[PDB]
Amino acid sequence: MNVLGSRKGFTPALQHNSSVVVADNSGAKEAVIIGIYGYRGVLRRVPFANIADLVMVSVRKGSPDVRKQKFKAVIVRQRMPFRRPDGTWISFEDNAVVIINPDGTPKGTEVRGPIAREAAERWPKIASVATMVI
Amino acid sequence: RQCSFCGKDILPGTGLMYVRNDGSLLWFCSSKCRKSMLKLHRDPKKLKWTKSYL
Amino acid sequence: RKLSSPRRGSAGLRPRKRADEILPTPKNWPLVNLKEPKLLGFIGYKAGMTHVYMIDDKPTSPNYGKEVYTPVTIVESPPILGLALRAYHIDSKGELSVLVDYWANFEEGSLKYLKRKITSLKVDSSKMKEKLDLIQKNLNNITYMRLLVSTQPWLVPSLGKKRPEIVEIQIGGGSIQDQLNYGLSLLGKQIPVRDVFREGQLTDIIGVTKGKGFQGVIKRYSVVEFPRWHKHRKGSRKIGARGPSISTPSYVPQPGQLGFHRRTEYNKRIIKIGDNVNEINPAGGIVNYGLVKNTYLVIEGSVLGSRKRPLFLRYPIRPSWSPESAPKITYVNLASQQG
RNA sequence: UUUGCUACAUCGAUGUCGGCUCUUCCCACCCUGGAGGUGCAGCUGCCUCCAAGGGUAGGGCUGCCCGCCCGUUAAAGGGGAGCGUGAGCUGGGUUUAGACCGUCGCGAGACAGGUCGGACUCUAAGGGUAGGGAGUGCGGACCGCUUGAGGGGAAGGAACCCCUAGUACGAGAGGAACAGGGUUCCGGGGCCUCCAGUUUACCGGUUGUCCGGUAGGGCAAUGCCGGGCAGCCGCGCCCUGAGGGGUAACCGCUGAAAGCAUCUAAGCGGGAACCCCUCCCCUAAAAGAGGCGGUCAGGCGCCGGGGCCUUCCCCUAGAAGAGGGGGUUGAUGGGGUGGGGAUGUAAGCUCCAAGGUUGUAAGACCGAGGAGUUUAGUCCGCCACUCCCAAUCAGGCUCCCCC
RNA sequence: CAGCCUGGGGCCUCGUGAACGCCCUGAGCCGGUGCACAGUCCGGCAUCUCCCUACACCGAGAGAAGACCCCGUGGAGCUUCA
RNA sequence: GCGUCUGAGGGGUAACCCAGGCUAGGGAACUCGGCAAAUUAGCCCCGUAACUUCGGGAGAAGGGGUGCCUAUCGUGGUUUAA
RNA sequence: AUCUAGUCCGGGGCAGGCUGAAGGUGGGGGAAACCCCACUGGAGGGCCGAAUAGGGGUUCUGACGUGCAAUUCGUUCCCUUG
């Protein structure tokens, strides 16, 4: 939303039908990557996603009122080894996303676990309720 | 900057940050160290090629 | 139903064959660009590579004024020993053949290194006088002026060889009369890379890539493994069809040699020209190469070709940006390439 | 492009749907470029024309095609090439033999109505293709370096963002573009610095086993497992402008025809992912078959030697060939010494040891294991120094044209 | 969305040692003509020879008087209210 | 008992084929179809649904322990043997 | 009718385990009707499982497909006291 003109993107992480946890207080707990915004691909190359990407998933485990529903989020946690511009390598023990409202602000009001610095700039609303940033 | 496991000197531009939910930091000289915790759980003390031997 | 697909493999470089001289040569030269007599390239060797720490010099860099990490290749730069001057002119039929050569090592150069590979001139008729003034007589009707130089690998134990290569470089500068005199001086002596280059320049690379042997189509042109079932059925590592008909069994991926090619490289900016071997030598002797003991060229990115290949360098043909000198550094990795 | 008829060709076979991979073409342009009109404030529109250089996805249902739909994207164009492609493939549809079901039949059974299974052959004579090699001519033998006719290209293409600018514009809601930067994606060419993987080089633990016990070993599709060098690739990293010329459509100007007018008729200027030149790649089998440097001696056909090749030792390289080196005037490979690495601390010795065996006691004896003896020991297709050993003996081919 | 390694083949070398396609050896490609898709014909474009390996694109490649449709006052079989 | 399921030697071993091993991250997006391949697996104990033809289903499901050594103990057999 | 189909006669085989019907016995709950538990008991066209114990040939449409052979080989299945 605000920083993607910089080095928005890193080594390949995820794919369609990839399952991630919901790290907030929204009510959703488990979600599967259903689609990728923006990206355009080529023959047989599965579409991509990593940290700080407008991503589209659906609710698999969570409150019934959100079960089997469509919502937007951003990617905050990945297991991939990758190289930061200052040449450090960051990883997250699992893969998590935070659901965002269609305007851009997160739907949830709480944040679970650390987030790589990159998401905060691309989504300052996330940084608004962000607790710790790595 | 010291390895979480072998603790030895980390010559710059390598290693990997495996950040947990707690925000703790894990530093590995190579793959040997990373396996030493994330999957081996073996004792750093139990061996004698890390300074934490005794 | 016949979905879109870019033609796979690279049709641009057909034919793909192996070079006939280990040390290639440029076929064009970037313009002189309004300056004085000096050379436009250099020779060297591929010693190894590492990663380096610098402040960004690109004024428009997104990383400007910060320390970022970047792989960097080392190029030992042994001194160059010139041989002769070659005359090119619009001859009969309006072509640019060699008018004449101008050799001189009888006045200086009691070196049998050249003798190892060429049974070169004797003192009996070292009468280049009538040759040299021929240039003077043919002055003002000359177009290009290259230079005969040789490498001196015997000053580098890393490459266990003693018969050297003699190769060419075209010189641009001010007036033609100046250039010949400029070259005339350079004969019979030794020339450092600093005599041609300075830090912060761009440089071009033509050389021979890492050979690989006869290859497979899977590897040669990155053709695709057939899906699933062929990993079990009738064969997997081949293209299915080979053309609509004998109407040109065409430029299609077919096996053959890959590597050892004459190739190209653009937009390479140097980092450091140091002279202390201890500043760059890694731990335990650089891998597969030895211990650099002459002046070296600190070039980032990747450089084509296998270790222990001569490399011939060149000014930028289509430089992307005009660089300033000295992208200062902050760290050099002396750690073992092993481990 | 289908679909209707035609039976001219194929019945001693042109093997039939789809799909997969892979190549190319075409333009009736989906997007990207150029120009314009508009019931075009701007964005979004709608439409015409030129333009085939490039791109034109990923999924669900259906075997397909078709069709319906999901979420992005610039859109997710349509057709050909024996409905491109089985001596490249899948057999899902469909063309047999077994059965069931529905309609009809007294019956053999028929159905174009549905459903389960049902064999997919070939060592490339010749060409094409992709590489790699010998020779003749170009011209006596050579060694070396170069000129650079044509050949191919997409060697780049695309999007998003920063600021322009919350500006222009519109009352407002809303909301531009030029240049300039940058990023990403896809594609193209490289490379292993680091990371990931790889590691039947190596090291350890450890089951079962036997070789008398330890040790050291055989084996058990590396016995299993843990680790990881180099090398190689990737999920890693690096490079991947623009301009000059001629043009399309068209936009102009000077201008008569035809006094005026008229962009056009001659005349003149601009004007595109359009064609070419600059870029890279292979080129003296280019027949005009190039040029330049040097040597081929010396002496009396002869002596002689000079060049080259093989042989020799290796690897920058690889199917051999080739290519690159070295060859006593030497660091090319082994040895040795150091250097830097991988495993993870050799044996034996000592001490301790859950308890027990003794032994009057004292003491000594067994014991899976822990510690020191010890960043050990083993190993390292890596580096340097060191002439200790090895590059010799030998064979072949050939020049004396020039004085 | 591909990658590395191992055994046997495949590479090479000694020995043994076949069969298939053969009017031919004269077959490069492109338009054209013609049984309406050529190796010879027509018009161009090129095109030095020899050798080895990989590819099966073509040779309307080879394998088999097509398993389908129909004809023959041709068979066989089955059935019945012939 | 065999080195006779009877041809062998060279090599840094190209591609490729057949047998395999292993692959980060995602985990059916491939695909007509999860085909293949993988995962589990011996044993003891605990614990075990709906339904039903009451017999099973039923190794339903699921959970826990399993080595090596220093000791022991219990049970039973056996030797002319309550 | 040395193959196969069938039958008859006379012969030769199915390593090891598991499961546990009937019945028997003893506890225990209540005078009863009889019920629960423990063991014993060893019935069944029952179950797992020995490449070549023996049988069939299931998927890999897996290799060969001018063979190991004019019907196989390796994988990979189901049966095994009737």
Count of CB atoms situated within 10 Å of the CB of A11:
11
Cβ contacts of C269 within 8 Å, gap of 6 or more:
C200, C201, C202, C203, C300, C323, C327
Task: Report the alpha-carbon distance of residue A92 to residue A77 in Å, rounded.
Answer: 5
Contact of C223 with C253, CB cutoff 8 Å: yes
Burial class of residue C312 (count of CB atoms within 10 Å of its CB; 0-12, 13-18, 19+): buried
Amino acid at B42: R
Closest A-chain CA to B31: A81
Tokens 């043919």 sit at which residue? C138
Q: How many CB atoms lie within 10 A of CB C56?
A: 16
* Residue whose pair of structure tokens reads 């007036």 in the numeric block: C175
In angstroms, the CA A35 to CA C43 distance is: 52
CB–CB of C167/C23 below 8 Å? yes
Contact A99, C77 (CB under 8 A): no
Instruction: Residue A33: name the closest of A94, A95, A111, A106 by CA.
Output: A95
Amino acid sitting at position A42: V
A72 CB neighbour count, 10 Å cutoff: 16
The CA radius of gyration of chain B, in Å to the nearest whole number, is 11
| Bridge partner residues of C274 (DSSP) | C296
Q: Which of A3, A82, A50 is nearest to B19 (CA)?
A: A82
Grouping H, G, I as helix, E, B as strand and the rest as coil, residue C27 is coil
What is the distance between the alpha carbons of residues C39 and C209, in angstroms, rounded to a whole number? 25
Alpha-helical runs (H) found in chain C: 128-137, 176-186, 217-220
Distance CA C141, CA C139 (A): 5
Distances (CA, A) of A102 to A73, A74, A122, B1, C261: 9, 12, 15, 43, 53
Which nucleotide is nearest, taking the CA of residue C231 and each C1'? F36
Q: Which residues of C171-199 are buried (b: 16+ CB within 10 A; e: fewer)?
A: bbbeebeebbebbeebbeeebbbeebbeb
Half-sphere exposure of residue C221: CA atoms within 13 angstroms, side-chain side: 21
At A6, list the tokens: 């910089």
- DSSP 3-state of C219: helix
DSSP helix/strand/coil, C123: helix
Protein residues closer than 7 Å by CB to strand F:
A 13-20, 32, 46, 79-81, 95; C 213-219, 227-229, 232-238, 255
d(CA C112, CA C115): 5
Please report residues of A whose CB lies closer than 8 A to that of C68: 85-87
Cross-strand bridge partners of residue A7? none
Beta bridge partners of C172: C38
Dist CA A99 CA C307 (whole Å): 51
CA to C1' distance (Å), from C157 to D387: 17
**C228 CA to D88 C1' distance (Å):** 16
Amino acid C225 reads E
The rounded distance, in Å, linking the Cα atoms of A89 and A83 is 5
Residue whose tokens read 């001010």: C174
- Give the integer Cα–Cα distance in Å for A16 and A31: 12
Q: How far apart are CA C310 and CA C302, in angstroms?
A: 16
- Asked if C115 CB < 7 A from strand D, the reply is no
- For C42, other C-beta atoms within 10 Å of its C-beta total 23
Cited resolution, angstroms: 4.9
Angle among Cα C279, C282, C285 to the nearest 5 degrees reads 120
Look up residue C216 and give its amino acid.
G
CA distance C269 to chain B (A): 22
Residue B50 to residues B14, B26, C320, Cα–Cα distance (Å) = 19, 16, 49
| Radius of gyration (C-alpha) of chain C in whole angstroms | 24
| Residue A51 φ then ψ, to 5° | -55, 145
When computed from its CA atoms, the radius of gyration of chain A, rounded to whole angstroms, is 14
Structural biology method used? cryo-EM
Q: Return the structure tokens found at C26.
A: 């440029």
For residues A32-52, b (16+ Cβ closer than 10 Å) or e, as one string? Answer: ebeebeeeeeeeeeeebbbbb
Location of structure tokens 């450092």: C192
Instruction: Using a 7 Å CB cutoff, list residues 216-235 of C near strand E.
Output: 218-219, 224-225
Residue written as tokens 């990383």?
C63
A66 CB-near residues (< 8 Å, 6+ apart): A26, A27, A28, A59
Q: Where are the beta strands (DSSP E) in chain C?
A: 38-39, 43-55, 67-76, 80-89, 98-103, 142-145, 148-150, 166-168, 171-172, 190-191, 202-206, 214-215, 256-257, 265-274, 296-300, 310-314, 329-332
CA–CA gap between residue C155 and residue C110 (Å, rounded): 16
Distances (CA, A) of C47 to A14, A15, C188, C206: 38, 40, 28, 16
Q: HSE-up of C93 (CA within 13 Å, CB side)?
A: 3
- Amino acid at residue number C188: G
Closest by alpha carbon to A77, among A31, A22, A30?
A: A22
Cis peptide bond upstream of C319, omega within 30: no
